[PDB]
Design a protein around this ligand. Structure first.
Ligand code: CLA
Ligand code: CLA
Ligand code: CLA
Ligand code: CLA
Ligand code: CLA
Ligand code: CLA
Ligand code: CLA
Ligand SMILES: CCCCCCCCCCCCCCCCCC(=O)OC[C@H](CO[C@@H]1O[C@H](CO)[C@H](O)[C@H](O)[C@H]1O)OC(=O)CCCCCCCCCCCCCCCCC
Ligand SMILES: CC1=C(/C=C/C(C)=C/C=C/C(C)=C/C=C/C=C(C)/C=C/C=C(C)/C=C/C2=C(C)CCCC2(C)C)C(C)(C)CCC1
Ligand SMILES: CC1=C(/C=C/C(C)=C/C=C/C(C)=C/C=C/C=C(C)/C=C/C=C(C)/C=C/C2=C(C)CCCC2(C)C)C(C)(C)CCC1
Ligand SMILES: CC1=C(C/C=C(\C)CCC[C@H](C)CCC[C@H](C)CCCC(C)C)C(=O)c2ccccc2C1=O
Ligand code: SF4
Ligand code: SF4
Lengths: 63, 195, 95, 733, 152, 80, 76
């Protein structure tokens, strides 16, 4: 389930530093109890100097 | 596109409309409901300038009065309009001014109540007594001849207005006269290039 | 210029225009954008009791429905056009 | 909900001194009180307007009363150019005898203050002549003050409380305000000019006891109703008319002369009567636009809904905007403040250049105070306009009911908007400052001919289009055969062309390079202040640094030191920042107005034309030169009537500088200090016995920004007013 | 003339200013021996002052009542040297700087650690881009026409 | 008392609980993330509002949010 | 603190110490003993110290001291 590893996904979570940008899929948690299972890496840190975040399947779009 | 060989025409202009030579570089007619209003508005403009350009040239060839001199009898208090020399027995300013408003506003508002789009621009009936629109093939031929003569008239009216702007007081026929004096010196060159 | 003649001719034409030539158009447009609404509902329907349309005044036995408000409206335009013509003629302006 | 802030149990339960402060500061934010409804919100505002009217009437009543009781109005009206108008008596037991003597001025028997408000010229121009005239005016306004409180109280009673639906009947309020509040009031004001003010200017005395038996015009209303309106313009006052006498007095009541009454240097009363009559007719016609109870008129909602360009470049156009506006009181107040701010500046610009009041043009200090007072009022009002735009975006904006409309589309491209304001401000700052600094260096190096001195040719060309001949441009009304010149030759152009080419009035002053530079300074200030304010409003809902900002409201201290630091991130803080920039801007505009006029009044505009192109000129030849009488209002050798302004001048410097403390030192420093004072107090005998009922705490973060801003603004205004008044009145321009 | 000014070559206050300026320097000149280094230096300033005033007069500069040149930036063809012409030169150079600057960020944007060439200039790369600026109007117009200049 | 809230984007890394200087927060069992725990705020009357917890939180958009609210002598951090 | 210390120093020295001595010993101090009656009000420091002694720097343009003029404005 979810996008494949190394997929190039556009971020659709509005409150996200990377909103409307794109990152790379690190892994997708296959446990169906995981609300935000898509791990994404980005090339620029956000204001907290963090470079990776978890997203929902509906918050991510392959491009 | 016929209006500019080698130039692709807009996709909504296929050449079927009368006078559709593919000219719309600003894409004004991309909104279809505006295109239809603009078709109606163009004909209305065409038919007025086709009446005006004779009205501007014929009296100048005849008795005194270029189209600007024909209007200087009003404004200044007095009023003595002359048609064909004879001062018309009603040519005072407020008389025709009311008659013009009442008559033109009535027939213009009547025009605006037509719901059908083809009758908004081609009404027919009383305005086609000689039955020129009966033949469908001939009907469309006169449609193109109308818009082409009308666009030429609008073009002439612009010349008349722009020539008046450059040679104030003069008339368009006097402009042609002044041109034929020596065409190689009395041209728009004087206007574009002062001195 | 006779003031009574100018005023009563202006009002006559304005009243004539509003009854025979412009009546359908004015009525059509009032129906098009009807009563003012707040949140999808007329002021009266929202509780503005003082916003009730006076149907009593709007009633008329005139064939097309020309009523007392139409007389006030088109009659006002006539008096305004009349006094524009009178005052404008009273001066000796030269352009 | 049991102590002081009855409207906020959240604050009533604060055990610290913070409770008292915030109780005061939030009392008028009705929306944030415990258990407000929409109805109560409208009703409190409505009654609050009646209280504001009551204060306005009460204030005017006192001004009238104090001039009648302690002023020299009756001597002023007999010699308006040789009597300093008295504001009120002063009674201060701290005065020494030399202060009692110095302040005894005018024809008064004791120390008085001289009025720089212009009310003498105003009241005289409109007909007031006697102290009694003033007394009954004050009593009438006292009655209006009382009535306004009666209605305010009344409409807070359940029988008379208006419903929300009534407050939202927009079409009806507009019709009534346009035709009635504006139109009939203007028509009535023209009636006063015709019946009282104009006879007053012609040496007649028309009052309630006799106004029914005297004709305003010998031909009565005959000409009005027959349409022979020209008769009312027939026999205008002579250009040699002496105001308040019959010398050269005519009989016209409605004229269109342009220009100035030559002796008073102010607009013709018969022009102002014609103006109020004409705009009244326009307001009265315009107030019939909107549909009410009669089956005619427009729906504003339908009009908005129709205005959507086919072609989609404004998305859904104006759809939804009626209820967005009609349901948000911050939207309404934003538009109100924005519009009132524009026209408050209009008042300042037009009153100095086209004065309406006889003998105010030569009361230089009054003209200086009036212009400065309205440009600062206008500035504050403009900042409020954006502050309530921000508050609108947080409290009231519904994204879904505005989806894709012109308002939502502003939020969609906020980065485009903000970054271009940023660009325009950067361009104007680099170049305006760069140009002044270049000129300064050229002056420094003894080479003033190497200045960059750009001619304000566009504005000079506009002055020439208006008929000013100073520049040889010969355009439009400066031409000889423009149709514009020909059309108005017979009417207002003779009196206008005369006034605009008289170079000793203030109508369209001559301008050179100095006027160019400071106008770009002014454009810098307008652009930067709106940058702060637009950025504040458009990010109020959220930014990338704080994407949920709307959940925190308009004012909050910050969002803590994480994510890199977030001090001053709220929309309230953007307002707070913008006030400094507005005070800067109005400073520049008022400095400019004053220095241009003081060198005009003194008879050497060249002092301004030359010293204003570099900044040392402003510091030395404006501030330093014009401070010498003010700072000597008291010195080791005595004092004089400039003593007050010398003291207020320093007072203003002191309040301003105290503001810096609240702005630069922040809370935590002071909270720890206060703790050692809590300890010390609980360990000091005798003082041990006394205990506070409110725990002492350092001020809040936001509180200190406000307190600092208020100190800064207060000292800003008091410093400049003291300087403005002393420098102008110490010499009379 | 334009804006009620008069040519600095006809202006009496302009001429007065040159005269007062030379007199100022001559008051200092008379302190020093004529061969001395200060005398030569003050004389050098004096000649430069004289060159400057004649130069402004011969270039057509208008002067105000103050005797100082005032620039006409309206577009009037007798004064293009006062704004249009040095302005075209500014925009040409400014665009050169910016176009070269963007070329470098684009050249390094796909590098491994891009911020490394932002704090330590890759000078060889920069010497290769520095002359892209010569034609920025054509290059920038070309990237526009084919979607390369702005992102969507 | 200030309001503290946790959102379900929380990855249960515990960093906010360790940052808190008055023990407002604790971890509780949860099935929503891999760490199978989520934060919780059962003692906000001791919350002073320093926001050390938000500084600690790794989620793009804070999983712990502090809304400063009604002040008490505990939230104001007074020892007197 | 240091600003008013150096201001204290400048005004005292110009007022009560520095100056020119006569042939007979008539000392003329730079500001002529004005420190005693002037430096006891803030208006005295505004008027008799800052406003008066700022004369030199704000009229330094056009002379070798003009770089102080520019630095005065620059530091502001
Ligand atoms: C309707 C077509 C038409 C015709 C037949 C003329 C004819 C004439 N114009 Mg005129 N004019 C026109 C349109 C026209 N104009 C328009 C549209 C404008 C607005 C730009 C002008 C503006 C204008 C000026 C300002 C002047 C003339 C002048 C003249 C006269 C000298 C010829 C010349 O300089 O042409 C000028 C040619 C052009 C402006 C090119 C466009 C003219 C038309 C459109 C060419 C096509 C004709 C048509 C397809 C057949 C001559 C009588 C001159 C005159 O009276 O001096 C003696 C003069 O000074 N014209
Ligand atoms: C003819 C009927 C009428 C009239 C006269 C008014 C009058 C007024 N209404 Mg209104 N109102 C009406 C009908 C009317 N209303 C109706 C029908 C409704 C229900 C649909 C309402 C509902 C309503 C609400 C809900 C509120 C008002 C308010 C107000 C007051 C606004 C504040 C003020 O003084 O503005 C004064 C404004 C002017 C005089 C107009 C001039 C404005 C320009 C910019 C100034 C021009 C300055 C000029 C140059 C002055 C010269 C300088 C000076 C020194 C001489 C004002 C008294 C408000 C109020 O204060 O309540 C107490 C308020 O909250 N009204
Ligand atoms: C028609 C005018 C008008 C109206 C009706 C409102 C109404 C409102 N505004 Mg608004 N505002 C206005 C004009 C207006 N404003 C202007 C002109 C500005 C620019 C300054 C602003 C800037 C503004 C901000 C920045 C804020 C408001 C807020 C508010 C709300 C509550 C205010 C409150 O409780 O403070 C009550 C205040 C007091 C009881 C006392 C305040 C005293 C002030 C601060 C200092 C006065 C100094 C004084 C001159 C000292 C003199 C010293 C002496 C020696 C001379 C309320 C909805 C606030 C709000 O709640 O929005 C969410 C808010 O934060 N407004
Ligand atoms: C002594 C001469 C002098 C000096 C020292 C400066 C110094 C400056 N100018 Mg100025 N300027 C001058 C003369 C001077 N100017 C003249 C004679 C004119 C008339 C043409 C201008 C017109 C001008 C404009 C229109 C702008 C500047 C800007 C600037 C600043 C950055 C410019 C730059 O190269 O960044 C290096 C270059 C870049 C970073 C690339 C972007 C900026 C350039 C200017 C874009 C140019 C291409 C673009 C298509 C042209 C502009 C289109 C339109 C707005 C005109 C800098 C403070 C810029 C500014 O204020 O920005 C806020 C700016 O936009 N100046
Ligand atoms: C005199 C004091 C001063 C100055 C110069 C500025 C300058 C500026 N402010 Mg600021 N501000 C001030 C006081 C001041 N502010 C105060 C008291 C407050 C209240 C807190 C604010 C609040 C404030 C806000 C909230 C905003 C500004 C903005 C701006 C910018 C306005 C646009 C502009 O002029 O671009 C031109 C830039 C300048 C004039 C700055 C100076 C340029 C220097 C002189 C060039 C240096 C060149 C030279 C080689 C340097 C050598 C130095 C050496 C050591 C290496 C600009 C950077 C706005 C902004 O950022 O807009 C984009 C904005 O949003 N300011
Ligand atoms: C405030 C706005 C404004 C703007 C944008 C301009 C813009 C311009 N002016 Mg200018 N001007 C203005 C106000 C303004 N002016 C005012 C108020 C005056 C009265 C003093 C002048 C007087 C003036 C003169 C006397 C001249 C200009 C010229 C020019 C052009 C500059 C050179 C050029 O690129 O030629 C390129 C020109 C074009 C692309 C077409 C220009 C012709 C059309 C009709 C415009 C340019 C179009 C010059 C010009 O047009 O040179 C040919 C010129 O001779 N201006
Ligand atoms: C590649 C360089 C470059 C380019 C092409 C631009 C281009 C632009 N900037 Mg930017 N900017 C830059 C560098 C650059 N900037 C730097 C270094 C800073 C930090 C000081 C800024 C700060 C800045 C602000 C604050 C603003 C802009 C704005 C703008 C826009 C309008 C023009 C303007 O205001 O110029 C302004 C230029 C400056 C303020 C300073 C930049 C000038 C430096 C000297 C040029 C870069 C030199 C660089 C080291 C070259 C190395 C290349 C080499 C290795 C080969 C435009 C998109 C404005 C905007 O968004 O409008 C829409 C705006 O508000 N910029
Ligand atoms: C919603 C509705 C509310 C709006 C309320 C607004 C007020 C209501 C409208 C009042 C209309 C009054 C107009 C009459 C008027 O003022 O004229 C009244 C004026 C007379 O009034 C003037 O009296 C003054 C006394 O000081 C003057 O000095 C003049 O002597 C005299 O002209 O009439 C004229 O002068 C008309 C001149 C025309 C010459 C022929 C005379 C014919 C008279 C025409 C009168 C027609 C009136 C029709 C009214 C219709 C009413 C059903
Ligand atoms: C039933 C009938 C009938 C009758 C009717 C009639 C006869 C009517 C009339 C009517 C009328 C006869 C009306 C009137 C109206 C009026 C009005 C409504 C007015 C208004 C006014 C105004 C509004 C004014 C204003 C003003 C002023 C006041 C001042 C100056 C300015 C002005 C002008 C603006 C008939 C036979 C036909 C038919 C059958 C049925
Ligand atoms: C944020 C926000 C807001 C705010 C806003 C603001 C604050 C604004 C401002 C604005 C403004 C402040 C603007 C202004 C404008 C102006 C104008 C628009 C003007 C115009 C003018 C004109 C047009 C003129 C012309 C002329 C001339 C010049 C001459 C004579 C003639 C004439 C008259 C024609 C609001 C509330 C909305 C809400 C939402 C949010
Ligand atoms: C100095 C000051 C301290 C301490 C000052 C506080 C404790 C104010 C104490 C004021 C006393 C009570 C005197 C108040 C005098 C006023 C004139 C009272 C006006 C009363 C109004 C209600 C009218 C802190 O509060 C600090 C807080 C945030 C950063 C800046 C500030 C600021 O620096
Ligand atoms: S704000 Fe400070 S105290 Fe309140 S929860 Fe977050 S960390 Fe703990
Ligand atoms: S810090 Fe953020 S993620 Fe880590 S536990 Fe607390 S809330 Fe959940």
């Amino acid at each position: 389930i979810g996008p494949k590893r190394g997929a190039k996904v556009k971020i659709l979570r509005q409150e996200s530093y990377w909103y409307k940008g794109t990152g790379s899929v690190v892994a997708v948690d296959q446990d169906p109890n995981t609300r935000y299972p898509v791990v994404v890496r980005f090339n620029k840190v956000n204001y907290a100097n963090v470079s990776t975040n978890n997203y929902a399947l509906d918050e991510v779009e392959e491009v | 596109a016929d209006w500019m060989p080698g130039q692709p025409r807009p996709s909504y202009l296929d050449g079927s409309a009368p006078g559709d030579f593919g000219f719309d570089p600003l894409r004004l007619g991309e909104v279809p409901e505006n295109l239809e209003r603009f078709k109606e508005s163009e004909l209305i403009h065409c038919r007025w300038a086709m009446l005006a350009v004779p009205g501007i040239l014929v009296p100048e060839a005849l008795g005194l009065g270029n189209w600007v001199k024909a209007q200087e009898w009003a404004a200044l208090p007095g009023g003595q309009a002359t048609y064909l020399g004879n001062p018309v027995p009603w040519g005072t300013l407020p008389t025709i001014l009311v008659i013009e408003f009442l008559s033109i506003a009535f027939v213009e508002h009547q025009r605006s109540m037509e719901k059908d789009p083809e009758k908004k621009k081609y009404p027919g009936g009383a305005f086609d007594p000689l039955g020129y629109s009966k033949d469908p093939k001939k009907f469309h031929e006169y449609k193109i001849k109308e818009v082409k003569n009308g666009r030429l008239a609008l073009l002439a009216f612009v010349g008349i207005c722009v020539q008046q702007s450059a040679y104030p007081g003069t008339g368009p026929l006097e402009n042609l006269a002044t041109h034929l004096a020596d065409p190689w010196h009395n041209t728009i060159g004087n206007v574009l290039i002062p001195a | 210029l006779n003031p009574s003649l100018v005023i009563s001719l202006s009002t006559g034409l304005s009243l004539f225009l509003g009854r025979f030539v412009f009546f359908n158009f004015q009525r059509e447009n009032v129906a098009k954008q009807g009563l003012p609404e707040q949140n999808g509902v007329t002021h009266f329907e929202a509780g503005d009791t003082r916003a009730k349309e006076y149907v009593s005044l709007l009633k008329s036995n005139d064939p097309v429905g020309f009523n007392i408000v139409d007389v006030l409206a088109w009659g006002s335009i006539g008096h305004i056009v009349a006094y524009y013509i009178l005052a404008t003629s009273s001066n000796g302006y030269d352009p | 909900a049991l102590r002081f802030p009855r409207f906020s149990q959240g604050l009533a339960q604060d055990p610290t001194t913070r409770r008292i402060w915030f109780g005061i500061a939030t009392a008028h934010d009705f929306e944030s009180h415990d258990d407000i409804t929409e109805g109560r919100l409208y009703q409190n505002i409505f009654a609050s307007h009646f209280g504001q009217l009551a204060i306005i009437f009460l204030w005017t009543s006192g001004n009238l009363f104090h001039v009648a009781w302690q002023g020299n109005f009756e001597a002023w009206v007999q010699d308006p150019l040789h009597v300093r108008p008295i504001a009120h008596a002063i009674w201060d037991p701290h005065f020494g005898q030399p202060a009692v003597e110095a302040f005894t001025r005018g024809g008064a028997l004791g120390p008085v203050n001289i009025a720089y408000s212009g009310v003498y010229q105003w009241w005289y121009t409109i007909g007031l002549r006697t102290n009694e005239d003033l007394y009954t005016g004050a009593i009438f306004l006292l009655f209006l003050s009382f009535i306004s409180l009666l209605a305010g109280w009344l409409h807070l009673q359940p029988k008379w409380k208006p419903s929300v639906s009534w407050f939202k009947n927009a079409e009806s309020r507009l019709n009534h305000h346009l035709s009635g509040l504006f139109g009939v009031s203007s028509l009535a004001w023209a009636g006063h000019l015709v019946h009282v003010a104009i006879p007053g200017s012609r040496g007649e005395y028309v009052r309630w006891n006799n106004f029914l038996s005297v004709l305003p015009h010998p031909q009565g209303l005959g000409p009005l109703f027959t349409g022979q309106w020209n008769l009312y313009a027939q026999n205008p006052d002579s250009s040699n008319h002496l105001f308040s006498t019959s010398q050269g007095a005519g009989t016209a009541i409605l004229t269109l002369l342009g220009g100035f009454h030559p002796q008073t240097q102010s607009l013709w009363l018969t022009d102002m009567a014609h103006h109020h009559l004409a705009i009244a007719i326009l307001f009265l016609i315009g107030g019939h636009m909107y549909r009410t109870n009669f089956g005619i008129g427009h729906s504003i909602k339908y009009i908005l809904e129709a205005h959507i360009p086919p072609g989609g470049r404004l998305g859904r156009g104006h759809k939804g905007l009626y209820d967005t506006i009609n349901n948000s009181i911050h939207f309404q107040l934003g538009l109100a403040l924005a519009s009132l701010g524009v026209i408050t500046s209009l008042v300042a610009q037009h009153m100095y250049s086209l004065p309406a009041y006889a003998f105010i043009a030569q009361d230089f200090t009054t003209q200086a105070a009036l212009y400065t007072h309205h440009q600062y009022i206008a500035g504050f009002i403009m900042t409020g306009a954006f502050a309530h735009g921000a508050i609108f975006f947080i409290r009231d904006y519904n994204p879904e009911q505005n989806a894709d409309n012109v308002l939502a589309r502003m939020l969609e491209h906020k980065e485009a908007i903000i970054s271009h304001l940023s660009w325009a401000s950067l361009f104007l700052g680099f170049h305006t400052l760069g140009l002044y600094v270049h000129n300064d260096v050229m002056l420094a190096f003894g080479t003033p001919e190497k200045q960059i001195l750009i001619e304000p040719i566009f504005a000079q060309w506009i002055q020439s289009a208006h008929g000013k001949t100073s520049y040889g441009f010969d355009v439009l009304l400066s031409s000889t055969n423009s149709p514009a010149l020909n059309a108005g030759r017979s009417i207002w152009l003779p009196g206008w062309l005369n006034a605009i080419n008289e170079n000793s009035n203030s109508l369209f002053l001559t301008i050179g390079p100095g006027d160019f530079l400071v106008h770009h300074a002014i454009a810098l200030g307008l652009h930067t202040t709106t940058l702060i304010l637009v950025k504040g409003a458009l990010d109020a809902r959220g930014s990338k640094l704080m994407p949920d900002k709307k959940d925190f409201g308009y004012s909050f201290p910050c969002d803590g030191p994480g994510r890199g630091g977030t001090c001053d991130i709220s929309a309230w803080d953007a307002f707070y920042l913008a006030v400094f920039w507005m005070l800067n801007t109005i400073g520049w505009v008022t400095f400019y107005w004053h220095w241009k006029h003081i060198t005009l009044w003194q008879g050497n505009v060249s002092q301004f034309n030359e010293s204003s192109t570099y900044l040392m000129g402003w510091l030395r030849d404006y501030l330093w030169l014009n401070s010498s009488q003010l700072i000597n209002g008291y010195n080791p050798f005595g004092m004089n009537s400039l003593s007050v302004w010398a003291w207020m001048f320093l007072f203003g410097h002191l309040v301003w500088a105290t503001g810096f403390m609240f702005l630069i030192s922040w809370r935590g420093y002071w909270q720890e200090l206060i703790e050692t004072l809590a300890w010390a107090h609980e360990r000091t005998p005798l003082a041990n016995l006394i205990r506070w009922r409110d725990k002492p705490v350092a001020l809040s973060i936001v509180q200190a920004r406000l307190v600092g801003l208020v100190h800064f603004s207060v000292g800003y205004i008091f410093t400049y007013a003291a300087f403005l008044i002393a420098s102008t009145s110490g010499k009379f321009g | 003339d334009i804006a009620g000014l008069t040519p600095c070559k006809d202006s009496k206050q302009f001429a007065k200013r040159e005269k007062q300026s030379i007199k100022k320097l001559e008051s200092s000149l008379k302190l020093y021996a004529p061969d001395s280094a200060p005398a030569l230096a003050i004389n050098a300033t004096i000649e430069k002052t004289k060159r400057r005033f004649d130069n402004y007069g011969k270039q057509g500069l208008l002067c105000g009542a103050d005797g100082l040149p005032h620039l006409i930036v309206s577009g009037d063809q007798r004064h293009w040297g006062e704004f249009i012409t040095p302005g075209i030169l500014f925009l040409y150079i400014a665009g050169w700087i910016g176009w070269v600057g963007r070329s470098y960020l684009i050249a390094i944007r796909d590098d491994k650690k891009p911020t490394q060439k932002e704090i330590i200039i890759d000078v060889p790369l920069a010497t290769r881009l520095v002359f892209r600026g010569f034609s920025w109007p054509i290059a920038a117009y070309r990237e526009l026409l084919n979607g390369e200049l702005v992102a969507k | 008392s200030h309001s503290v809230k946790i959102y379900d984007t929380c990855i249960g890394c515990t960093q906010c609980v360790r940052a808190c200087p008055t023990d407002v927060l604790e971890m509780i069992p949860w099935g929503g993330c891999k760490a199978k725990q989520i934060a919780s705020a059962p003692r906000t009357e001791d919350c002073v509002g320093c926001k050390r917890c938000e500084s600690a939180c790794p989620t793009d958009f804070l999983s712990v949010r502090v809304y400063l609210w009604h002040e008490t002598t505990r939230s104001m951090g007074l020892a007197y | 603190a240091i600003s008013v210390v150096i201001f204290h120093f400048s005004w005292k020295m110009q007022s009560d110490v520095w100056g020119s001595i006569n042939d007979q010993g008539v000392v003329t101090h730079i500001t002529g003993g004005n420190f005693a009656q002037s430096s006891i009000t803030i208006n005295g420091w505004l008027r008799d110290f800052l406003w008066a002694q700022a004369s030199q720097v704000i009229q330094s343009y056009g002379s070798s001291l003009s770089a102080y003029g520019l630095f005065f404005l620059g530091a502001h």
